């Protein structure tokens, strides 16, 4: 059981050892297409590459590469696309992927500039009168509206294919206070955000997989996806306590390398699932408590 395990590891002070065991047991698959010379400028980091078997392929005959992976969680019946923060030359590819994969939501867990360094490109328009045209892929992106909160921002974007004139509404969920290789302020602030993404309809199987990213799209992204998947599993299993977080993370790591980058991010995933379990059990009032403790207003 996860709660008794959490307390046992917290008392022993063995979080570093538990996380190092997951890293040792983690899958190792080829990333041949990612390491190809022509794809060097399409990768933000040399040590973060998608596996060939799970990589997302663009529908262009020229070069189908994008540093993105499809996490297919079979039992939980949910899929996520984890990608890197797009580079100045891959912003068109990013939106081409969103279009082709029919994604309705994009979850951003980082900031454009963290500690005076560019971690992600400004891939979306900041002003509504200033739309962005990606000439390479023939796509137009316009900011419709934005709801700014204390630690997160929800944006309504319009994505248009200029060849067909087809229009789609994309929701952009931006967590603005999650530092690199860090954890959120509290389980309440994380869960309030996760449930806002859930209630929007962006995670529905009627749409394509949600795009989740950070700078590399492995650390903060892995924490978000692990918490979401573990909460989904304890709803349909009829035995909530049968969910093993470490096993779910190893299953996720079969699709993209290095999901969850620190021992504290793993510990936080436990805290997030234990606190989130209260809502899944039937107590509706805990969602209202998360809204108060998150300090969104």
């Amino acid at each position: 059981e996860m709660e008794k395990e959490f307390e046992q590891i917290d008392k022993s002070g063995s979080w570093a050892a538990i996380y190092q065991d997951i890293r040792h047991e983690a899958s190792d698959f080829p990333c041949r297409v990612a390491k190809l010379p022509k794809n060097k400028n399409r990768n933000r980091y040399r040590d973060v590459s998608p596996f060939d078997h799970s990589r997302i392929k663009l529908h262009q005959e020229d070069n189908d590469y994008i540093n993105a992976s499809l996490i297919k969680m079979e039992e939980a019946q949910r899929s996520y696309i984890l990608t890197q923060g797009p580079l100045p030359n891959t912003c068109g590819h990013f939106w081409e992927m969103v279009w082709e994969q029919k994604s309705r939501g994009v979850v951003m867990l980082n900031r454009v500039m963290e500690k005076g360094s560019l971690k992600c490109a400004q891939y979306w328009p900041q002003k509504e009168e200033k739309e962005m045209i990606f000439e390479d892929t023939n796509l137009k992106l316009t900011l419709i509206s934005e709801d700014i909160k204390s630690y997160y921002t929800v944006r309504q974007l319009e994505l248009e294919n200029l060849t067909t004139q087809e229009t789609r509404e994309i929701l952009h969920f931006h967590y603005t206070t999650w530092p690199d290789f860090g954890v959120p302020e509290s389980p309440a602030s994380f869960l309030n955000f996760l449930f806002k993404v859930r209630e929007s309809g962006s995670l529905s199987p009627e749409h394509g997989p949600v795009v989740v990213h950070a700078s590399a799209g492995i650390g903060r992204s892995g924490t978000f996806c692990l918490a979401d998947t573990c909460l989904l599993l304890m709803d349909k299993r009829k035995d909530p306590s049968s969910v093993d977080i470490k096993k779910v993370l190893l299953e996720m790591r079969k699709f993209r390398m290095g999901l969850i980058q620190t021992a504290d991010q793993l510990r936080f995933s436990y805290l997030a699932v234990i606190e989130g379990a209260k809502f899944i059990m039937g107590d509706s009032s805990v969602q209202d408590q998360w809204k108060e403790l998150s300090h969104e207003d």
Binding site: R44, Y45, D47, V48, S215, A216, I218, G258
Partner: peptide, 6 residues
Amino acid sequence: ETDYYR
């Protein structure tokens, strides 16, 4: 930097 894994 061109590395993420520290």
